[PDB]
């Protein structure tokens with residue numbers, strides 16, 4: 019399963035391949051993938 | 064050292080336009096060919112080639128570079144070998160090369 | 162049962178079979194990954210028309226229409242002549258059936274996938290001995306129902322009947338015949354999944370709740386109630402429509418939404434007596450029909466449910 | 470600076486003169502071809518997927534999408550999708566019984582690179598799952614830019 | 617030996633038989649031995665004549 | 673020209689059919705097959721010819 | 729969007745004077761030129777840096793956060 | 798890689814003689830007769846024999862050989878078919894010329 | 909007689925959607941164009 023965030027109520031959900039794309043709390047049909055937890059390097063130039 | 068002439072110097076409002084060189088630069092040595100004409104594909108996004116148009120052909124004719132014109136039209140583009148019958152000029156010769 | 166006419170790319174120098182091959186699309190080459198030898202060069206990547214060989218098979222045809230300069234006499238005569246074709250007549254029936262299916266689905270405001278699946282089912286089940294004495298209306302309605310179920314947007318028998326004028330006996334017989342045909346072709350030549358089941362009452366609840374204008378929280382509570390309603394033997398035998406309607410009514414009265422059973426049954430085309438009767442059975446197990454999280458949070462408790 | 474050219478201060482460019490953000494969006498859908506064929510977002514493997522691109526699939530997740538904040542470069546795949554194939558079709562050999570899927574992924578533009586900013590997954594009017602992926606990049610003035 | 621990732625370098629080597637070798641994926645066997653009559657497709661270096669045009 | 677062009681040859685009795693290279697079948701996603709306009713017109717010609725043969 | 733850290737032309741630090749500039753304009757009722765002079769910005773390159781800046785981060789902060797924590 | 802070596806002499810085109818196909822020449826040149834208006838068989842796996850995309854007319858795929866010359870897509874020039882029309886039909890590009898010749902010659906003896 | 913089939917809403921809906929999505933003002937060209945969002949003045 020992977021972690022998503024509702025685009026309206028900003029609730030974290032845990033969705034699988036079989037689960038429908040929908041917020042179980044408010045019912046919104048748009049989810050934003052949670053930001054990756056691995057560090058990303060940036061140059062200060 | 065001081066410049067002999069004096070320079071008009073001051074703030075001015077400048078705008079950055081949408082055209083960037085990194086979004087236009089593209090070169091091709093070889094690449095995919097279109098199914099229909101078997102010539103270099105169009106579009107820099109697909110590693111396509113540049114057009115050697117009629118005006119370019121006329122300029123090369125004026126220069127007299129016949130060999131360069133032939134190389135551009137054959138070696139840098141579609142080049143196909145076909146078998147023709149001496150009785151009929153039709154290219155309907157079945158060639159079992161193997 | 163025919164000539165091979167197959168080309169296999171292998172590196173003569175490496176001789177490894179199967180070979181490691183890399184397709185350099187940018188360079189237009191096919192190169193051996195081990196030695197780097199180029200095996201084939203000058204590889205290829207409106208002038209044509211697209212078609213779907215699943216609903217139309219192999220049938221190439223062109224229309225005749227007006228141009229920048231044209232005389233109506235030639236167009237009329239040419240269309241008349243083109244109409245009188247014997248070979249094309251056979252497929253024109255399928256095309257007309259597709260047109261009517263499209264009209265029905267579009268009037269039903271169904272998604273494109275539903276009508277595409279309906280057309281596919283109609284084409285697969287057409288031209289068979291079993292379906293020869295049944296009305297085209299029944300055939301089309303059964304195909305539409307099958308497509309709706311296959312698209313996870315399953316509708317109900319009454320809902321489809323609201324558009325297609327076919328009686329229940331003919332509709333059910335045709336549906337069974339079509340399902341048998343689909344199963345037979347799935348075996349001999351997939352088709353069905355958990356969705357193919359008949360009851361599937363969970364799918365109906367959101368649409369009924371939308372028709373009644375209830376909030377999504379009430380819709381989810383009704384879905385949970387209907388899901389747990391199958392554990393009671395006194396109700397599991399009821400129609401899925403009745404099960405879903407009774408669950409929705411129970412949740413409506415749980416949340417004290419000012420909608421009476423007289424209007425719930427009128428909107429969902431279900432008898433008010435039936436609704437209240439089902440509520441009577443479910444009231445004896447109200448405790449197992451309410452979400453533990455909801456009752457714990459306290460949005461509402463068991464109290465807000467009048468019992469006769 | 471002759472013939473409508475200009476000379477710009479490299480120090481000013483370093484300090485942030487005429488610097489811009491570039492956002493590019495890619496869209497992809499799960500198409501259902503009939504009751505038999507259907508496409509799915511997946512991370513194709515070298516043993517079950519045919520004609521998969523030469524790029525790197527290491528950045529994809531189990532859902533076939535790159536999480537935001539990850540860096541991507543040329544030829545990198547950002548949306549991984551697979552579709553089934555019909556049997557009795559062998560192309561350049563290399564087609565064994567193991568292969569049952571083919572790649573239909575959406576690769577990043579060859580000359581573009583950056584960091585994935587926002588990826589959203591939703592359903593279209595027809596209920597099919599589709600995703601939108603946005604990539605950020607920084608454009609700094611160069612010796613060819615127009616002002 | 618420089619290869620196709622360093623200018624000046626080379627990208628393809630064509631033997632007298634007409635077959636073409638991509639220097640990429642070829643370093644596994646080491647540097648190739650060149651023979652007279654072969655062709656090396658090398659990056660355009662300084663002083664190479666090239667035709668420069670502007671449309672129209 | 674008696675050898676290369678006679679007036680009788682301006683009327684078509686045998687229509688040559690170009691090979692697929694002249695009328696290739698394009699593909700968008702390679703899961704959907706498209707046929708050339710020449711292929712469509714040739715199919716129309718064949719259907720009309722068969723209809724006329726069966727009629728007469 | 730936010731005040732630049734350094735002046736583009738010369739590199740003087742100007743990102744630590746935005747709040748002071750706003751405070752001088754509001755509380756002290758000082759003119760923009762007088763405030764710029766009081767802040768120590770003598771060259772017009774820095775004067776324009778602070779005078780022509782547009783604060784769009786304030787508008788961007790009006791939207792609800794995409795992700796909570 | 799390039800195209801395979803051939804034993805035929807290499808020459809340069811010096812003259813082009815235009816003309817019109819005779820029906821006999823079309824039939825002789827043709828390698829197959831097309832009599833089906835389809836492109837693929839009922840299985841949509843291989844091209845139907847005698848159809849529009851008959852394998853004897855050539856190949857436009859990198860994976861299939863030509864049933865006539867047994868060569869790949871990059872070597873097969875393509876082979877022509879033919880359709881025997883039920884009745885003679887005019888050439889759209891020669892209708893005016895045919896009309897002029899008809900007005901010039903007698904419509905009963907051809908003199 | 910069924911009103912749901914007598915009146916087809918797709919006529920109006922598809923006609924308007926097509927005429928607005930494409931510039932062909934039928935069933936003139938370029939009547940509808942994708943709004944420029946490169947900058948506010950544009």
Ligand SMILES: [Zn+2]
Nearest residue numbers: 024027041044
């Ligand atoms: Zn939500």
Ligand SMILES: [Zn+2]
Nearest residue numbers: 148149150151
């Ligand atoms: Zn000959």
Ligand SMILES: [Zn+2]
Nearest residue numbers: 172175193196
């Ligand atoms: Zn090898």
Ligand SMILES: [Zn+2]
Nearest residue numbers: 735738773774
């Ligand atoms: Zn300064």
Ligand SMILES: [Zn+2]
Nearest residue numbers: 855863866873
């Ligand atoms: Zn051939």
